[PDB]
Amino acid sequence: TSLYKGVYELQTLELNMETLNMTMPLSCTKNNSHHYIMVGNETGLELTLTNTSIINHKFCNLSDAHKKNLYDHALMSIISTFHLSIPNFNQYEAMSCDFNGGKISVQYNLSHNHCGTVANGVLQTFMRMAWGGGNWDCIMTSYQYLIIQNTTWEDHCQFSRPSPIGYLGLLSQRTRDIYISRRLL
């Protein structure tokens, strides 16, 4: 109905990204706090911002998880990409995990210049990962925990459409801002 130069009618299209599900992961946002990344039609990860922690120990037994080799390889790959993308992560106590039985549960304790804290790096990475919704690029929230757990497929994308863009963009961020912890990497 909108006519430009008298001869050019303006038209739009919207891509149904959902059809990419078998060849790339799809991230979406349910609301401010809840976000999902689905891999195929059967499994995925739920990312929750929450005041209720679910892990009450200081362990993250990654090597035992690898040796047991019970987890889903795609989910562990995604988790690794997320963690390697965090900038300036230097408080290993802030991350606790549970992999018993092959499940994937990772919890970041965000409680405490506020910019140079684990909470900021974690939240920036989370913002990049779902890309769905302080000084310089600094982010702060009121949430005490970020929890990442495996989940089955369900139509979660109420606030934003599923998209692989965040994950693909984050792929290049891996190891970009990691610190050296020993002289021999």
Binding site: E9, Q11, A74, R128, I165, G169
Partner: protein, 166 residues
């Protein structure tokens, strides 16, 4: 490096060397075929989000057709192909615009002009979002006007060179 994936030949003969998006790839569940002019830009442009989404979709279809798809996912395949498929810096630029409060692209929606009489169209450009909502048409009408002008100038130049050759 730079993207390299060549688009597969369009199924629709209306656009011999163009590309067609079938009903499954679009929300309006219709078929949209783009001509040779718009698709030729996708080989050399570096800032067209739409050409990166086209490469993603084409890779998806070809992988589904030539490899035996299973429900368990091969993250490895896309992990290796990603930089051959899309410019991750386009993504970074959209992120930077987002964090700076500048209107940005969510790769969801695209606008293009359609020359009713002939059926020729322009290369779709991303419909930007800002403050959680799509920009009103009046906010970027200048870019649409620019697109009409360029499609005019290029058509005139092609017609002149045609006249020249004959």
């Amino acid at each position: 490096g730079t993207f390299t994936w060549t688009l597969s030949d369009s199924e629709g003969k209306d656009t011999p060397g163009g590309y067609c998006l079938t009903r499954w790839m679009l929300i309006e569940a219709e078929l949209k075929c783009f001509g040779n002019t718009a698709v030729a830009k996708c080989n050399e442009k570096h800032d067209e989000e739409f050409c990166d989404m086209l490469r993603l979709f084409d890779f998806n279809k070809q992988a589904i057709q030539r490899l035996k798809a299973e429900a368990q996912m091969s993250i490895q395949l896309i992990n290796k192909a990603v930089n051959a498929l899309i410019n991750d810096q386009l993504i970074m630029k959209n992120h930077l615009r987002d964090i700076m409060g500048i209107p940005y692209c969510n790769y969801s929606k695209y606008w293009y002009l359609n020359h009713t009489t002939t059926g020729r169209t322009s290369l779709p450009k991303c419909w930007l979002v800002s403050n959680g909502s799509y920009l009103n048409e009046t906010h970027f009408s200048d870019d649409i006007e620019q697109q009409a002008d360029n499609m005019i100038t290029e058509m005139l130049q092609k017609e002149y060179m045609e006249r020249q050759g004959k």
